[PDB]
Amino acid sequence: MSAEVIGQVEEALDTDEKEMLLFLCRDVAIDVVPPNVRDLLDILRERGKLSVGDLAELLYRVRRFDLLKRILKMDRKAVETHLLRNPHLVSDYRVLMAEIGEDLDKSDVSSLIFLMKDYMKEKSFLDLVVELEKLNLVAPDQLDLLEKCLKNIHRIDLKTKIQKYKQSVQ
Amino acid sequence: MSAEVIGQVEEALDTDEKEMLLFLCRDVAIDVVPPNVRDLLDILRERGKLSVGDLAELLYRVRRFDLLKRILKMDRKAVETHLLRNPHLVSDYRVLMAEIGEDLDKSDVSSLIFLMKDYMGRGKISKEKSFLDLVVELEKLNLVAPDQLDLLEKCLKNIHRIDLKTKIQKYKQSV
Amino acid sequence: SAEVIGQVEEALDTDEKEMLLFLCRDVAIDVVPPNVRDLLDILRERGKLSVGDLAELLYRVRRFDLLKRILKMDRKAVETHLLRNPHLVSDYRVLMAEIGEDLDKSDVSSLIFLMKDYMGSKEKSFLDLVVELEKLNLVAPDQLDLLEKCLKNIHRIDLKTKIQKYKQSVQ
Amino acid sequence: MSAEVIGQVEEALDTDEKEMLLFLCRDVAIDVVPPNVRDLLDILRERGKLSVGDLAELLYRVRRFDLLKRILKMDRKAVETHLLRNPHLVSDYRVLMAEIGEDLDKSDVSSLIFLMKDYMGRGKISKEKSFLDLVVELEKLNLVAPDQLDLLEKCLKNIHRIDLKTKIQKYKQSV
Amino acid sequence: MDPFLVLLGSVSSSLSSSELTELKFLCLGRVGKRKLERVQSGLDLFSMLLEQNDLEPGHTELLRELLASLRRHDLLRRVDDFEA
Amino acid sequence: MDFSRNLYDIGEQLDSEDLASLKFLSLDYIPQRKQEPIKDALMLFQRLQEKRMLEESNLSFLKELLFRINRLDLLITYLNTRKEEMERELQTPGRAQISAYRVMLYQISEEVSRSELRSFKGGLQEEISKCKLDDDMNLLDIFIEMEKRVILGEGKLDILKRVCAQINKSLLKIINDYEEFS
Amino acid sequence: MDFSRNLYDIGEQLDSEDLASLKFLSLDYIPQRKQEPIKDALMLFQRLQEKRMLEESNLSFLKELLFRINRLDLLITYLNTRKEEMERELQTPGRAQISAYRVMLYQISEEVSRSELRSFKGGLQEEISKCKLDDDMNLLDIFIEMEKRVILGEGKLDILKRVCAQINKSLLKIINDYEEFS
Amino acid sequence: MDFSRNLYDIGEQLDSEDLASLKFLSLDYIPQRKQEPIKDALMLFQRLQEKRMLEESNLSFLKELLFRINRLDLLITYLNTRKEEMERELQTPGRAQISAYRVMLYQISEEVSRSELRSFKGGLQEEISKCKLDDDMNLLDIFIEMEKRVILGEGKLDILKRVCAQINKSLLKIINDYEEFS
Amino acid sequence: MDFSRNLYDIGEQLDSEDLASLKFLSLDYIPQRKQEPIKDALMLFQRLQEKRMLEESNLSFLKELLFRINRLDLLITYLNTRKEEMERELQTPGRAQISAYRVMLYQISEEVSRSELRSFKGGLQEEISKCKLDDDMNLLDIFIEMEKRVILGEGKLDILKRVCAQINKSLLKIINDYEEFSK
Amino acid sequence: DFSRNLYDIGEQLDSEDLASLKFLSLDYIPQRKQEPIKDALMLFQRLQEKRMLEESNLSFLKELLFRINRLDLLITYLNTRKEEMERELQTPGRAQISAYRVMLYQISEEVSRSELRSFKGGLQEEISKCKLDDDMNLLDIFIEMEKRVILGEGKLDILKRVCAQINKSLLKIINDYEEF
Ligand SMILES: [Se]
Structure with a gap:
């Protein structure tokens, strides 16, 4: 692990992938609020939470296996075995949030925002999740409102994903 | 209450929440004009106006309930009960101003600035200014006040924002 | 008193402080006050900081909240005082400040690019440019033709008419 | 040359050009760290190392040909012939550093600083560092030198500035 | 891999908008709906599959499958020409 | 004045x-x-x-x-x-101060549409990092990024010809006219 | 008020x-x-x-x-x-602040449909680069580009008449009516 | 709720x-x-x-x-x-928020087919430019343009009656029914 | 698979x-x-x-x-x-996901020709505006417009029977069979 | 070219x-x-x-x-x-159009307008009236029959039934295809 690796990863990511990476690491950097992804990775490395396996997990969550093979020289088997044997840096709740966000187009996100204006710009679903977290409306143990709102926009598949996560927590 | 709490609050807030928090404490920090939020909190603590309940109210006004639960270990009901039992650090006027500002996009704020430029005297500054900055400018010109909201009411009516006019009217009725 | 001067110095903003220094450039003779606190101290020591003088200074920077909180005066009272008593700050400085407030950074940059020929720095305020021109004898209460033409060339005819209105106000 | 010339040069330069001029004369420094450029030029004149040709070379390195013709009454051809026929006041290493610095935007400079912090450290807390400031920091840490450019080569390669790597290679080949 | 990139570019340029929507529907499951909404060309989807390592010059199974589903063997011949 | x-x-x-x-x-x-x-x-x-x-x-x-x-x-x-x-x-050969290479690049940028620019960026994936391939990059910035990596130049036109052949045919004509002018 | x-x-x-x-x-x-x-x-x-x-x-x-x-x-x-x-x-003469040459042009833009605009842009292929002929451009932007390339003007209407004749005849009538007011 | x-x-x-x-x-x-x-x-x-x-x-x-x-x-x-x-x-009077003039207009748009809309556009040639009379315009956009050019309005229904009488009688009947509410 | x-x-x-x-x-x-x-x-x-x-x-x-x-x-x-x-x-009851009311409507569309569709549109002149009765409208779109105007529904089949009786009798047979199934 | x-x-x-x-x-x-x-x-x-x-x-x-x-x-x-x-x-290999398809088309070559009316009247119990409209030729009827799985390479019973009621050459073509 070095600065060259962080630079390569930062230069290989796009704006949306950077925004997603910032959201996934919200649970590990709760004190400081890193502005850019480079600062986030630097903070994680300084705090000893950015080993080769941690960066491998981060690249695996954004589904950038080309970077896993080119930069970190790792395949899916290595990252999956590391995640099986070592504790995860990003919780399953954040991965579920990101997955739900990836299965939503801008129209669905707009309709979802319109439903939740009673309880609470082209803002992404992850920004809405951050706003709900700041308002204590969504949490790994508090998904009922998001489930109902996804049901009301006729997105029963995402409701089923949330229910599968809830059953996986048991 | 300690320095760690102030540091956590200052580092956990974003730019918009910081700018809002500075505006909400304008009525209690008159003797100093705090540049950053940390200086504001230090001044409030030194002058004895930053107890645990005061910081809880400040976090509740910026709608940062996650910080209310993580830092101060409080829910919304507890902070509301504290506001019921104790006099408020932030007046309802500042909260109303912030509420009106949150329901205004850049286009609405620009159109509102264009309607008021006759009473301002402000020149050609092109820096996109927030509604709270406009309220600060109006206060500097003695054009808006908790007992002087007619100009803001009329200008919000003229930009077709009748809901904010109703917020102003309900605030006036609560007095 | 000193508490009032301290309150005024702490209550002013950077732009308001710079404007106050520029407006008091003509009354602080032989001295160049760096900060507003030093300027107010000099004015008080020299006997040029009465209640009316501070009221006029606060009125010129359009800081009526300090006029109401500190000096307990409305805009009408200060305007009547300015009507009845001689001014501490001449109308030329007020016109310069008004023109500067009606100029964006791009307009000031283009104006500096036009005037750089008559004065052989970046991010300069309009008041700094006016001070530079005054030190070079390029602008004066009786010498506004060059500034007028330069404002005409940046397609700012409203400021040219402000200058013409000042010229008509002189007689 | 004379004092009026030094005064005109000091008054005509901007902050970035002043910083660059201070960097180019770092090798000639007579056991002193001059803060101001006027002081540096005065020291060079007193030490007999600021003739008309030396100041012409200094103005040529900062690409201020208008000052070269207005103050010293020279064109590019005259100063280029003077540099061809006479030994230089500023070594080719400083000129290479200045050229590399001019071919780097803020993003490339930030990425270069981010790469150097492993070999160097955070250094000055200021986030507005020029390439020349970084070169000075590396020189103080014995990380870059006219005979030690491999680290700079690698760091420029990692920020995809192969043209600057070729500049460094051409300098290495010319010695 | 520039020959592979020119393969992908030629295949993307030889597709219509309807075929692009068909490919978008076919790739749903490997690529999210949000990412598919931003796809404006076959090359975009091919590059998104390149990043996820579901597609590479060594393993062209996904490309051949997607292109055979669209009953377009004219571009399958281009793929086979690249394979040799 | x-x-x-x-x-x-x-x-x-x-x-x-x-x-x-x-x-x-x-x-x-x-x-x-x-x-x-x-x-x-x-x-x-x-x-x-x-x-x-x-x-x-x-x-x-x-x-x-x-x-x-x-x-x-x-x-x-x-x-x-x-x-x-x-x-x-x-x-007249001497009086030209802007190099014909620059003018040629600029004219290529003048003969590339928005979808053609997107295809250009997609064709330069292996040679330029993704951060420099954002939608806000015009073709001239891509030319600059290529010049940084010594992929584009007065003597290195291979990748330029490759991407132009990947997008349009008139661009190769402009490149060949510049090359024949030498 | x-x-x-x-x-x-x-x-x-x-x-x-x-x-x-x-x-x-x-x-x-x-x-x-x-x-x-x-x-x-x-x-x-x-x-x-x-x-x-x-x-x-x-x-x-x-x-x-x-x-x-x-x-x-x-x-x-x-x-x-x-x-x-x-x-x-x-x-009343003199009191018109918008030039008759400008107004005329705008009125031409009032009598051009979408297909007629596509035909205009296709007719200006040899004189204007492709970047300025993209589909996201109305007729007024084409007029501006023509004025930039000094092919359109109050004294240079030849190419305007040529391209208008290829689409419609009433446009030539507007051009000639403007010309007679001189 | x-x-x-x-x-x-x-x-x-x-x-x-x-x-x-x-x-x-x-x-x-x-x-x-x-x-x-x-x-x-x-x-x-x-x-x-x-x-x-x-x-x-x-x-x-x-x-x-x-x-x-x-x-x-x-x-x-x-x-x-x-x-x-x-x-x-x-x-009940007063409680209607949409003006009777607007509703009437919309109801006219309910009784016009495609060929009748084409005849409407052909009948409004001298008052409206060609850009607003293209085949992709609906009758409501024509109403909006006519209101813009102050030829249609709550007090000016003459041109509307003229164009409606040339196509169908029920449109004129609707206009007269709206007029009787006065 | x-x-x-x-x-x-x-x-x-x-x-x-x-x-x-x-x-x-x-x-x-x-x-x-x-x-x-x-x-x-x-x-x-x-x-x-x-x-x-x-x-x-x-x-x-x-x-x-x-x-x-x-x-x-x-x-x-x-x-x-x-x-x-x-x-x-x-x-098997319950197992039908498409309502019997919908299918019935579609089946009516199965027994209407082009001239019969023209007669259908002519029979719905007083209830539907001309814009929704244009020649580019199939019978299913007319059903949709009727449902919008609460003229057609599971409990309101009067106008449907009235317009169908003027054209053909088998359509009334389909309507009556649907009604006899929903006892 | x-x-x-x-x-x-x-x-x-x-x-x-x-x-x-x-x-x-x-x-x-x-x-x-x-x-x-x-x-x-x-x-x-x-x-x-x-x-x-x-x-x-x-x-x-x-x-x-x-x-x-x-x-x-x-x-x-x-x-x-x-x-x-x-x-x-x-030659039995280079023919790309299936013999089942060609046969069908050839039937459409040997049917007049009144015979088309008789065909449409003969397919009343299997096809709805909407697909039996007057603008329907025999090829569209073949397509509809294939959709309703009554016509096919292994299901020619209804085809022979309707063809025998109209003409004998149609059944002859069907039998010639079957013998091949
Ligand atoms: Se004072």
Whole structure:
């Protein structure tokens, strides 16, 4: 692990992938609020939470296996075995949030925002999740409102994903 | 209450929440004009106006309930009960101003600035200014006040924002 | 008193402080006050900081909240005082400040690019440019033709008419 | 040359050009760290190392040909012939550093600083560092030198500035 | 891999908008709906599959499958020409 | 005196895209560090005056810049120069200050649409990092990024020809005309 | 009757197409650099206010602009001016602030459909680069580009007539009617 | 009452044609600049919510809009209001928020086919430019343009009668029925 | 089993008329705003997939749709379901996902010719505006407009019978059979 | 100039020839892909996308033009006589159109208008009236029957039943196809 690796990863990511990476690491950097992804990775490395396996997990969550093979020289088997044997840096709740966000187009996100204006710009679903977290409306143990709102926009598949996560927590 | 709490609050807030928090404490920090939020909190603590309940109210006004639960270990009901039992650090006027500002996009704020430029005297500054900055400018010109909201009411009516006019009217009725 | 001067110095903003220094450039003779606190101290020591003088200074920077909180005066009272008593700050400085407030950074940059020929720095305020021109004898209460033409060339005819209105106000 | 010339040069330069001029004369420094450029030029004149040709070379390195013709009454051809026929006041290493610095935007400079912090450290807390400031920091840490450019080569390669790597290679080949 | 990139570019340029929507529907499951909404060309989807390592010059199974589903063997011949 | 006003009027009649074109065509004389803060024409003019390539007695480089960006209206109205006069002056081999390589690159950028630019960016995936392939990058910035990696140059036109063959056929004709001019 | 409120109401009743028409009709008074950031009507008004062409005592240019874009409803509702009045005001010589050459051009843009615009752009292939002929450009932008390349003008209408004859004959009638007013 | 969810379902049961009808029916309250970006029903609701014309306690304007576009199914399913009620509610004077002049116009748009719309456009050639008479324009846009050119209005129905009489008699009957309410 | 490719082939064997029929039969689950941009079968499937009514383990709604549009070839070729099965599956109560009211309407559209459609439009002159009675309107769109005007429904079949009696008698037979089934 | 030759061949074909070619190409172009084909050229392009039409493979185009009895185009634009095509199609392998399809088309060649009325009247119990409208030719009836799985390569019972009630040559064609 070095600065060259962080630079390569930062230069290989796009704006949306950077925004997603910032959201996934919200649970590990709760004190400081890193502005850019480079600062986030630097903070994680300084705090000893950015080993080769941690960066491998981060690249695996954004589904950038080309970077896993080119930069970190790792395949899916290595990252999956590391995640099986070592504790995860990003919780399953954040991965579920990101997955739900990836299965939503801008129209669905707009309709979802319109439903939740009673309880609470082209803002992404992850920004809405951050706003709900700041308002204590969504949490790994508090998904009922998001489930109902996804049901009301006729997105029963995402409701089923949330229910599968809830059953996986048991 | 300690320095760690102030540091956590200052580092956990974003730019918009910081700018809002500075505006909400304008009525209690008159003797100093705090540049950053940390200086504001230090001044409030030194002058004895930053107890645990005061910081809880400040976090509740910026709608940062996650910080209310993580830092101060409080829910919304507890902070509301504290506001019921104790006099408020932030007046309802500042909260109303912030509420009106949150329901205004850049286009609405620009159109509102264009309607008021006759009473301002402000020149050609092109820096996109927030509604709270406009309220600060109006206060500097003695054009808006908790007992002087007619100009803001009329200008919000003229930009077709009748809901904010109703917020102003309900605030006036609560007095 | 000193508490009032301290309150005024702490209550002013950077732009308001710079404007106050520029407006008091003509009354602080032989001295160049760096900060507003030093300027107010000099004015008080020299006997040029009465209640009316501070009221006029606060009125010129359009800081009526300090006029109401500190000096307990409305805009009408200060305007009547300015009507009845001689001014501490001449109308030329007020016109310069008004023109500067009606100029964006791009307009000031283009104006500096036009005037750089008559004065052989970046991010300069309009008041700094006016001070530079005054030190070079390029602008004066009786010498506004060059500034007028330069404002005409940046397609700012409203400021040219402000200058013409000042010229008509002189007689 | 004379004092009026030094005064005109000091008054005509901007902050970035002043910083660059201070960097180019770092090798000639007579056991002193001059803060101001006027002081540096005065020291060079007193030490007999600021003739008309030396100041012409200094103005040529900062690409201020208008000052070269207005103050010293020279064109590019005259100063280029003077540099061809006479030994230089500023070594080719400083000129290479200045050229590399001019071919780097803020993003490339930030990425270069981010790469150097492993070999160097955070250094000055200021986030507005020029390439020349970084070169000075590396020189103080014995990380870059006219005979030690491999680290700079690698760091420029990692920020995809192969043209600057070729500049460094051409300098290495010319010695 | 520039020959592979020119393969992908030629295949993307030889597709219509309807075929692009068909490919978008076919790739749903490997690529999210949000990412598919931003796809404006076959090359975009091919590059998104390149990043996820579901597609590479060594393993062209996904490309051949997607292109055979669209009953377009004219571009399958281009793929086979690249394979040799 | 009037010279500065004329420069200001010329700059006021220039847009941001024309400004980017002017910055690209003057890359061989103004480096990137000094070119980054150039957000108005007057600043470019100031830099040129600092390099004596623009004076009241030297309008050659300004006329060449305004002619190559096809802003003949400003050339005829503010600089008193016609199109034919400029053609004749630029047919002489010595008088051309902007390299034919720059002009050729700029004309390629003039003959590339938005979808063609997207295909260009998709064709340069293995050679340029993704951060520099954002949708806000025009073709000239991509040319600059290629020049940084010594992939584009007066002697290295291979990848340029490859991507142009991947997008359109007239671009190869422009490249071959420049190459045959040598 | 607040002047600022009246201007705001007038601007609220104008869409992006009317805004582009007003920006084109004010090209002779607002340069390209100052026209680029104009994304709403109020901004435009401010520019006019900086040249004293719009104040509570000078509504002539605003009324002329609203009349040339055929927005008589705003003229009668917010400016208290009927259709006939303006006509007489614009029939007196000298008092017309928008040039007859400009108005003519805009009127041509009023008589061109989408397919006719595509035919125009396809007819200007050899004279204008592809980047300035993209599908996201209306006829006024084509007029601006033609003026930049000194192929269109008050004295240079040859290519205009040539391309208009390839599409419609009434456009040639408008061109000749403008020409006779000289 | 999930007021936002109810509004969302009502909007989900509305297509683009009903949206254009609602936007036309709300012209007297939402200006053109604010109507231009309205591309879905929800947005429209927000505008109404900004004027207090749509709230959990004030559904009168929403019910009137849904009744005038003949979407009684949404009125009965999501707003719990049958056809008769609305009628009585709209027969009481003052309570009608949409002007009778507007409604009439929309009803004319209900009784014009495609060939009749083409004949309408051909009959309005001397008063409206070709850009607004293209085949992709609907009758409501023609009404809007006529209102802009002060040829159609609450007091000026002459040209409307002229063009309607040339095609069908029921349109003139609707016009006369609207006129009798005076 | 490439479920997506199989759905793609099924969509490739469907034209625009079958697509309009499927969109009408899916009106009870997909609103008008979501149905408007549906110009191909695939997109339609996507909407169903968003409501958990179409997946690799749930083919009931797809089979019902293909059976109601009389596309038994697709049922036998791509879904491995014969004609008899889909009958028994739909004869068991509860198991029918498409309402009997909807299917009936579609079946009426199966027994109306072009001149009969013109007569239908002429019979609905006083109840529907001319814009919705143009010649480019099929019978299903007329049914949709009637439902919008609360003239057609599960409890309001009066105008339907009135207009059908003026054209043909078998349509009244279908209507009466539907009424006799919903006792 | 292969592209110009294809364009000229397509320009010499009317809408009826286009419908015949689209029916004869049903085994290679699905219904959704056939719907927007409103000219002959657009059909050829589809074949080019399936590698059944190129400058080196004209077999399928020649077979289509021969089965539609357009020998003039074969002689003028493809330089191929009737005997060449006879020999080419008599070999049991190179024939690309299935014998089941051709047979059907040939039945459509031997049915008059009154016979079409009799066919439509004979398919009342299996086909709805909407698909039996007066604008329906025999090929569309074949397509509808295939959709309703009553006609096929293994299900010819209803076809023989309806054909025997009208003419004997139709049953003769069916039996000739079956014996092959
Ligand atoms: Se004072």
